[PDB]
Every structure is written in C-alpha cells, then in structure tokens.
Ligand binder design. Structure first.
Ligand code: SF4
Ligand code: F3S
Length: 106
C-alpha cells in the first residue's frame, strides 16, 4: 500500500488522484488518504505529489508510522475522490511545515 503522510495536511493538491488507476483515494476536509486494501502498489502517485507526502508503506519515515494506520482508518469513513480539484487556498504556505497532524480535520 502507498500511504499519504503529514505534508499533505492543509495542502491537498489532489494531483495524486489523476494518476490512480484504481481510484482508491478518499477525501477529507484538508487531507487525502489511500485505501490499503484497494491500492495495487503501482507507485504512479508518489512522483505526482507536489508536497512529496506519499510513500510506499515500507518507506514511511520512522516518525510518521502513525500515518499507515491513519490511512487505513480514515479510508473507511471518508468519501472517494476521483477527480482532481484545486489545492487548498493557502497550500504553499503550509507546504513543508512540520507537525501538521495536529491540524487534521475529520
Ligand atoms: S500506488 Fe497506484 S493504486 Fe496506490 S494510490 Fe498510488 S496511484 Fe493509486
Ligand atoms: S498533497 Fe495530498 S492530495 Fe495527493 S497530491 Fe499530495 S497526497
């Protein structure tokens, strides 16, 4: 499974959803997640993320291990997104800011 981590929060560029062949991405107010059961590990999304927030499960940084299980949990409750949309207004102010998990909205 590929996993979306911290830097997607408050950026949500959604470029990853264009490229996903199986549409396994689910949408929240300010963050996106990958459904681990549905992802086919094609890796096409991670070159596409401008925030470089997507990682292969086995490459998730040590300090972002929470995100693996978070993607599995939220993907069960959030709606599927299948079309790109605009980034959040202020996405490049928040791009590269650390510790954005305290701003995650359900
Ligand atoms: S690795 Fe492929 S199947 Fe998984 S979320 Fe990324 S683009 Fe979709
Ligand atoms: S910022 Fe998030 S919405 Fe997709 S393109 Fe990157 S994982």
């Amino acid at each position: 499974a590929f996993v979306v981590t911290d830097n997607c929060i408050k950026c949500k560029y959604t470029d990853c959803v264009e490229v996903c062949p199986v549409d396994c991405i689910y949408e929240g107010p300010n963050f996106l997640v990958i459904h681990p059961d549905e992802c086919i590990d094609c890796a096409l999304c991670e070159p596409e993320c401008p925030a470089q927030a997507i990682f292969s499960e086995d490459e998730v940084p040590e300090d972002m291990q929470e995100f693996i299980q978070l993607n599995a949990e939220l993907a069960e409750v959030w709606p599927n997104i299948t079309e790109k949309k605009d980034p959040l207004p202020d996405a490049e102010d928040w791009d590269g800011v650390k510790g954005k998990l305290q701003h995650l909205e359900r």
